[PDB]
RNA sequence: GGGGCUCAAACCACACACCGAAGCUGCGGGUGUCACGUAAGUGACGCGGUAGAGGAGCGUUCUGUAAGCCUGUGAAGGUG
RNA sequence: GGGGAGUGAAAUAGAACCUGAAACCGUAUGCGUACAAGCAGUGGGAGCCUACUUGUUAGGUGACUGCGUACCUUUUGUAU
């Protein structure tokens, strides 16, 4: 029973070189960099599901303090203001309505302004 | 009119005619679902938020369908360690359609 | 549209689309000047090439001289020749004696 | 049937094989370690 | 999804600062916050929502301490040897609106991104600028 | 004195986007109407409207 | 670290608020072990990892199953 | 050496001849590239171009931007 290697081989490279189209140069055409372009892209990516929740997180907070600062509050002052009240709102929907619906947005902050933190 | 739910651990700016993916939320295909955890509701200059929760607002939704979205990798390498693990992942997903906005 | 080729040029193709590049696109008179008047061993070859081309057009078609534009022009890898120089210190070295394929493809668009 | 007669649970075994792969628990060593005697050709101490 | 500015339907405004006796770093961090947009909130990261800002009086800009015979300027010229230095006060009599572009010019981001921000900011020496047509209101008055 | 590295297909074609070719300095003789190197001898011998071999 | 900072953007206190991690919590999945369960069936604690131990799989070629089944109305291979 | 015509079921089975992969080299189309600094990706993301049939899609480029010093082997330890 010698079996022939060559068919499986095949398929397995086209795989890593399929999951790697798309890169610079050899990055894209040969195995040995193919591979270690698909692999780092991995570790990327795992890390970066990550860093997503980190980024977005912080331009709502930037939308947030600059949208307060129109109405004359911090950001922190208005965080602390909406658990004085109880607002169990986020900071996604308050950057949405920061940018989008700005008199809700402007009701929001004087609720916050109204329990004076 | 839009309104902000909360259903899945995580709440969704809302409006009155709006397919929505959602975390899988256990109820048959074509039913309906309320959202009695509005944050607030607003229609025009009147706007109302939720004291904790607006009280006297629900949301109405059907299901529209339960599916899985797009297949993330997990790729697990330590350099020189010998060490490779990869795994799939498929999020479940359960998609409304809003229905009525209260 | 009406292609004539040329399968193994002894030219290598990196010194033949260098006058490949010069006729593309072109008249057909206007490429015939350019090759005719070139400096080089290429415009012999690929003038040759683009007389049958025209020929082909002529004879199997009915396409005018005149119409034809040369609209593909193209230089392919042809099989190399494998030699051996004799160089110093006991020390022998390949040389590959490169070939290549010309295609010209005349049209009246 | 030819087609349907298998040994019972436990009775046979897959004999894991060393070198395939890292993901196998037995790449790039099959279980003899590092350098040293016993991880050679021939690699054994006498009795 | 988020909202994302983009750059075609970025609403830019124009403002004049008048440096006639502000501190440096303290009008700059103000000008460098207005140049990316932080001000705004459809601020995002990778588009310029910023305004343009004129200075106008821009050698009556005041360092406090003993910055004014202090804080050199370096640059060096490529060739060796080539470090070169200027204080504040023989910058400010030299090129006055130079003091002001290289603070606010380090506090925006090292990209082209900072490049195009810092193209925002038209610093100027004596008490006017050629900016009448785009109209630009005062602020921090 | 040798390469640490093997070029890549760009710059080796950003070296080489210099070595195209020109030679259009043709004219055509009015009296026999063929076409020739300017300041140039015809391939049928003529220049500048006579013939001189 | 840089810009820059001087009733500070430094230092010594004290206060209140905020940001900040793959930590915790929420929400949705998978898995190990243990205990329960006419075996649907839940709970509870887990689940970084080199050498290494242990457990369970995929695929390739051959033989039986196979004088079977598929296939020129198109096999294997190759490329999407 | 080709372009036809014929033969043949098939000649992109034409004699260097079944299939005809990858490296490597081209031509064509789309998009991006000439004020921008580094393992060349990855998270975000505008624009443009194609198919659809239009939308909270599919494919292709990816300006701009946050994070980011290959793989192996050896080692107490390597972007080294």
Redesign the pocket.
Known sequence: ?????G??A??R??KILKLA???????????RVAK??V???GQ???????????????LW?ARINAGARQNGLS???L??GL?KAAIEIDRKVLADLAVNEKAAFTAIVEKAKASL? | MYAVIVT???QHKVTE????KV????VATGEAIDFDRVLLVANGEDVKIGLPVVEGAKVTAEVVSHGRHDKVRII??????????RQG?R??FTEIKITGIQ | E???????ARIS??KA?LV??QI?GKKVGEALNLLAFSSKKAAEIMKKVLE?AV??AE??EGADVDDLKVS??????G?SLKRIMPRAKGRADRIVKRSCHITVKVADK | ???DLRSAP?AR??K?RPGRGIG????????????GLTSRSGGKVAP | ??Y?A???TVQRDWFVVDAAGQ????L??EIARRLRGKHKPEYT???DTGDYIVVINAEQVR?????TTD?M?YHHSGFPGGIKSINFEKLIAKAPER?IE??????L?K?????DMYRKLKVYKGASHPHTAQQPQELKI | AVQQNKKS?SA??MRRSHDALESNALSVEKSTGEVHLRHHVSPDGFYRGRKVV
């Open positions: 029973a010698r079996v022939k290697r068919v499986i095949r398929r490279h086209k189209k798309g890169y610079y140069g050899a990055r894209s055409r040969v195995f270690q372009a692999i780092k892209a990327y990516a795992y890390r970066d599901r990550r860093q997503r929740k980190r980024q977005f997180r912080a907070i950001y922190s002052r965080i602390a658990k933190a | 899945g651990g995580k005619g709006e397919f929505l975390e899988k939320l256990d697990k390498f330590r350099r020189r360690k010998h060490h490779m693990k992942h999020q479940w | 009406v292609a004539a080729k040329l399968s193994g193709a990196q689309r490949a590049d593309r049958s020929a082909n004879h199997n593909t022009v193209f230089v392919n890898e099989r | 049937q030819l087609n436990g075994r897959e894991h196998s628990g037995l790449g790039k060593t099959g279980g003899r370690g590092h350098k | 999804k988020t994302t983009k750059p075609e501190t440096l770093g303290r700059a961090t990261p990778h588009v360092v406090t301490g003993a910055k804080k300027y003091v290289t603070a606010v010019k380090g506090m981001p990209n082209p991104l900072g490049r | 297909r080796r074609d």
